[PDB]
Amino acid sequence: ASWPSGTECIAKYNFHGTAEQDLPFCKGDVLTIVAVTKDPNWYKAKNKVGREGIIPANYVQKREGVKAGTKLSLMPWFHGKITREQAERLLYPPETGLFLVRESTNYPGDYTLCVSCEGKVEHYRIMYHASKLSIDEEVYFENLMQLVEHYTTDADGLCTRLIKPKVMEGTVAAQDEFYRSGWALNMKELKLLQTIGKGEFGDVMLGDYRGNKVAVKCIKNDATAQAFLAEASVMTQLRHSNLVQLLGVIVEEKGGLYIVTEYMAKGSLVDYLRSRGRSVLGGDCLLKFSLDVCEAMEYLEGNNFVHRDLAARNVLVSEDNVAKVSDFGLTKEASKLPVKWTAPEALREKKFSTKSDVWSFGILLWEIYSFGRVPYPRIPLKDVVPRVEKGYKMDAPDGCPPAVYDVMKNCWHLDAATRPTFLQLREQLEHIRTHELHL
Numbered sequence: 001a002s003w004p005s006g007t008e009c010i011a012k013y014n015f016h017g018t019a020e021q022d023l024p025f026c027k028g029d030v031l032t033i034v035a036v037t038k039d040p041n042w043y044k045a046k047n048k049v050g051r052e053g054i055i056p057a058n059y060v061q062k063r064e065g066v067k068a069g070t071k072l073s074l075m076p077w078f079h080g081k082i083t084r085e086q087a088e089r090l091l092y093p094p095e096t097g098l099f100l101v102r103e104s105t106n107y108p109g110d111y112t113l114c115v116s117c118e119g120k121v122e123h124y125r126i127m128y129h130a131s132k133l134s135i136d137e138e139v140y141f142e143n144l145m146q147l148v149e150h151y152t153t154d155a156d157g158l159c160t161r162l163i164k165p166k167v168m169e170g171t172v173a174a175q176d177e178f179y180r181s182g183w184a185l186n187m188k189e190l191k192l193l194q195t196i197g198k199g200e201f202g203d204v205m206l207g208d209y210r211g212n213k214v215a216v217k218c219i220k221n222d223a224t225a226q227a228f229l230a231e232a233s234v235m236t237q238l239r240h241s242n243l244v245q246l247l248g249v250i251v252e253e254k255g256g257l258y259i260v261t262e263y264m265a266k267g268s269l270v271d272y273l274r275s276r277g278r279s280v281l282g283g284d285c286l287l288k289f290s291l292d293v294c295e296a297m298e299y300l301e302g303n304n305f306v307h308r309d310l311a312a313r314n315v316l317v318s319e320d321n322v323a324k325v326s327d328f329g330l331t332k333e334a335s336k337l338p339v340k341w342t343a344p345e346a347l348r349e350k351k352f353s354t355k356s357d358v359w360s361f362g363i364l365l366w367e368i369y370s371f372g373r374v375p376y377p378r379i380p381l382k383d384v385v386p387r388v389e390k391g392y393k394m395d396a397p398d399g400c401p402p403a404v405y406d407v408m409k410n411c412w413h414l415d416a417a418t419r420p421t422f423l424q425l426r427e428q429l430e431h432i433r434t435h436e437l438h439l
Contacts, residue, residue, distance in 0.1 A: 002036035003043060009033060009060035010182040023053025028189070028210055031060055063182030066174075068233035074174045074225050074251065075145060077101055077165035084123065087114040090166050094119045097163025101126075101144055111144065111223070113151070117159035124158060131221035143223050146255030174229055178249045183236055185209065185248035185260055192216060196267075201329060206263065214247060215261040219329065227329065228257045234305070234331050235259070242296035244316060244326035264324065266317035273312065274372035283401065283438045285321075286368055290404075291429050292323035297361060298422035300325075301354045304333050308352050310360040311341045312367035340375040344389050345416050355416040361425065362411025369404060370397040389414070403437040 003009070011029045015022070025031060025047055034044040034052060046052045066072075082090070082102040091098055095116050104110040104125065111126040113135065124135050126147065132140040133147050136157050141147040148162060155161040178184050191208045202219045219228045235246035250258040266272050269289065273281065293315055300307055308330040316326050330337070335351040343359035346352050363375055376384050376394060393412050396405035407428055413419050420428070432438050 002040060003033045003057075003062060005033060005035055007033040008063040008182075009045070010063050011059060012061050013059055015055060015059050019054065021054045023047060023051060023055050025055065026210070028185075030063070031055060061180070061182040065237040066177055066181050066183065066233045068226075068230045069172065071170050072172045072174050072177065072229055072233070074229065074257075075101065075148075076167040076171050076173065077148070078144065078171075078224065079166075079168045081105075082168075087123070088121055091116045091121050095164065097160055098166055099148075099162045099164070100166040100168075101148070113147075113158075115158060115160055115162065120159075122159045128223060133223055141255070142220075143225050143255050143257070145225065145253070145257075149254045175251050178232065178236075178251075181236065183232075183246070183248050185250045187250055187252055187256075190214075190216065190250060190258075190260070207260070209247070209260060213263040213265075215244075215263050216250075217259045217261060218257060219259075222257075225257055228259070231329050231331075232259055234328055238300075238303075238305075238328070240296055240299040242292050242322070242324050243299065244324045261326075264316035264326070265319040266321070268313050269315040269317055269323055270312040270367065270372045272317045273368065277371050278399075281371070287404070287429065287433055287438045288321075289315075289323045289368055290365055291426065291433070293325060293364065294361065294422060294426045294429055296325040297357060298426055300331075301357070301422045305331055306334055306352050306354055307331055307357050307360070308337060308346075309341075310357055310364055311338060312364055312372065315364070339381065339384060343416065344385060344414065347385060353416070354422070355419045358411050358419045358422065358425065359416075361422070362408045365404065365408050365411070366394055366397060369400045373397070401432070401438040403432045407432075 009031045011025050011027055011031060014027050015025050017024045023045060030048060031045045034046060036043045037054065041057050042054050043057055044052060045055050077100050079100055079102045083105060087100055087102060090100060091114060098116040100114050102112050102114065104112045106112065107125055110128045111133070113124040113126055115122050126133050126135055127137070132142065133144060134140045139150065141150070150156065151158055152162040189210050193206045193208055196204045196206050202217055205216045207214045207216045219231065222228050232249050244264065245262045247260040247262060250260060307325065309327060310325065314325065314327040315323050317323050334353060337346060339347065341360045341363045343356035346356035366375065367373065379387060393409060407425065410420050
C-alpha cells in the first residue's frame with residue numbers, strides 16, 4: 001500500500017535530484033507525503049518549508065509511533081527474573097564468553113552476570129547503589145549496557161571476557177524499532193555543547209544536531225534503560241503544538257542513552273517568570289501561558305495519558321513565548337510524585353488519574369500568578385498533605401484575578417470527581433479572557 005497523503009517520512013540519505021520535478025533534501029529531513037505517483041517508487045511530497053516535488057520512496061522512512069511493550073528492549077542478553085539454574089540451562093553447552101544478565105534472586109534489588117568460562121558458569125553479583133552498577137566496586141556504570149561494553153572489551157577480573165550474548169526469546173531490539181519508525185539519530189552529528197541543567201532524575205544539555213540547536217536528555221538511575229524506553233516511546237506518540245517535540249533517539253552501544261528534543265530557548269516557565277517578573281509580564285501573558293498548558297493537558301487527557309508531574313518547572317518556553325509541557329518521564333495511560341504538586345488521592349492511592357493532573361494544574365496556575373514562587377510558602381513540607389486534607393488551600397496570589405483564583409480553587413476540590421475536565425478548564429479560561437476578567 002502506498003503512503004497516504006499526510007504521512008511523514010524521515011530522509012535516510014541525501015537526495016540530490018534526478019529530474020527538475022524532484023525535491024532535493026538532506027539526511028534526517030522530515031518529508032510530508034502528498035501523493036504517490038504512477039510509479040510506486042516515487043512520491044510527491046513537501047519539505048518543512050512547504051516546497052513540493054518528487055522524491056524516491058526508497059530514500060525515506062515512514063515515521064511512526066513505538067509502543068514500549070513488555071518485550072521492547074535494548075539488551076538482548078537481559079533475561080529479567082531468570083533463575084540461577086535457568087541460566088545454567090540457558091548456558092548449558094560450555095562456550096567461552098557466552099553470557100547473560102538477570103536480576104538477582106540471591107541478592108534482591110541487584111543484578112547478576114552469568115558467564116561460561118571453562119566447563120563452568122561463573123555468576124558475578126552486580127551491586128546497585130547510589131544509582132550505579134558495579135561488580136568490583138572500582139569501576140561503576142549507569143546501566144547494564146555499559147557494564148557489558150566494559151567486560152566485553154576485557155575480562156577485567158572476571159574468569160573470562162564476554163563474547164557471545166545468550167539472546168532471550170521474544171526480545172525486541174528497540175534500536176531497530178526506533179530506527180524503522182524514523183526516530184533514530186546519529187551520534188556523530190550531535191555535538192554536546194553545554195549542560196543546561198543537572199537534575200535529580202536526569203540531565204539536560206544544549207546541543208548541535210546537523211547545525212541546529214537541540215536539547216539532549218539522559219535519564220538517571222535507569223539500569224535496564226526501561227525508564228529511557230518508556231519516555232522515548234510515549235514521546236513518539238505525542239503530537240500537539242504545546243508539547244515539547246521529540247526529534248529523535250540516540251543509542252550508543254557503549255550505553256549512552258539520549259532523548260533529543262526541540263530546543264526551548266527561554267528555559268523553564270518558573271525561571272522565565274522569576275526573571276522578567278511582575279513589571280514585565282502582563283495579565284494577557286499570564287493567561288496566555290495558562291491556556292497553552294491547558295490545551296496541552298486537554299490533548300493528553302484526550303489521548304488517555306496522565307502526566308503525573310505537571311509543574312511550572314516542567315513547562316518550557318520557546319523563543320517566541322510559547323509555553324509547552326515537557327518531561328514526560330512519568331507519563332502513562334490512566335494508571336515518585338512531587339508532593340507539593342500531587343493530589344491527595346494520588347499520593348495515597350496507587351492509581352493516578354486526569355483528576356490528579358487537574359489538581360496539579362491548579363497548583364501550576366498558582367505558580368504562574370505567583371511568578372515562580374514555591375507552593376505552600378509558609379508551611380513545613382510535613383504539614384502540606386495533612387493541612388490540605390484538612391481543607392487548607394493556598395491564598396490567591398498578589399494581584400491575582402478573582403476568576404483565575406476560582407479556577408485554581410476548582411482544581412483543589414477534595415473530591416476528585418468534582419474537579420473540572422481540562423476542556424472545562426479551557427472553556428472557563430476562555431470565558432475569562434473573552435470578558436477580560438483578568439485585566
